[PDB]
Amino acid sequence: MIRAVFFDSLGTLISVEGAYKVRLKIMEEVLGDYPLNPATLLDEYEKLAREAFSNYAGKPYRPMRDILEEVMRKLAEKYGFKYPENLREISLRMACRYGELYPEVVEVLKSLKGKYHVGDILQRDTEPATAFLDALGIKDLFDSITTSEEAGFFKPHPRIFELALKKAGVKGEKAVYVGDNPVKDAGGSKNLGMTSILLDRKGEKREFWDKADFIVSDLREVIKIVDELNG
Ligand SMILES: O=[N+]([O-])c1ccc(I)c([N+](=O)[O-])c1
Ligand SMILES: [Cl-]
């Protein structure tokens, strides 16, 4: 049976408008009056961030805030603005202020929490991640919160999933994982026996649906999938 349901909250349950707005507001704060379009800075930042994380996939953990501060230092040198002090404080303030959940998230977590172990699996530094979950109001809706900082390795390394399952006290066969990127999922959770649910809200990832056991566009479909797996 399924006894645990795991999500990637800060990575996949934040609205698309909300995540972009947090990031844009960080760039605007960093730039101040400097004559660079913040949207252009954001685009360049995401490019360099994706590159930097790909270099760390599967590797031993290094604070993500340190990685992103390195990226911002390269951007400051590139465009000529002064490197912002306290970037991680700016970012946490903007996340707490403008972060936004998909509308069905609170309902879904509450509906599951009574009957399953509801867990979060996050590739974030634990302290800002947990503060962000607190600001969003869902921290205490989770039975467990597990991070790459706790596990010691970046995905697709399986240690983070091994730890999340240990916290729930079950083997992977008893657990579902809801994500939006199936490759860092498959490279880890598949070998542990977990059932994978891909969240594809706009149907934009059809070429990866074969890498997932179930595909949904609304998180309220998750309870129906698990309730039925449990007959
Ligand atoms: O998303 N961002 O734009 C962003 C940039 C830099 C940092 I150090 C963070 N942070 O604190 O995680 C976030
Ligand atoms: Cl982080």
Author numbering: 1 to 231
Relevant lines from the article:
SNAr1.3 can operate at a rate of 0.15 s−1, perform more than 4,000 turnovers and can accept a broad range of electrophilic and nucleophilic coupling partners, including those that allow construction of challenging 1,1-diaryl quaternary stereocentres. Biochemical, structural and computational studies provide insights into the catalytic mechanism of SNAr1.3, including the emergence of a halide binding pocket shaped by key catalytic residues Arg124 and Asp125. In summary, we have established a biocatalytic solution to SNAr chemistry, one of the most important classes of transformations in the chemical industry.
We facilitated structural analysis by a K39A mutation at the protein surface, which has negligible impact on activity and improves data resolution. Notably, despite performing evolution with aryl chloride 2, enzyme activity is improved by 3.8-fold and 8.6-fold using the bromide-containing and iodide-containing analogues of 2, respectively (3.67 ± 0.04 and 8.34 ± 0.11 mM−1 min−1). To explore the potential importance of the halide binding site, SNAr1.3 crystals were soaked with substrate 5. The corresponding structure revealed two distinct anomalous signals in close proximity, associated with the iodide substituent, suggesting that the substrate binds with considerable conformational heterogeneity. Notably, the major 5 pose places the halide substituent directly adjacent to the aforementioned halide binding cavity.
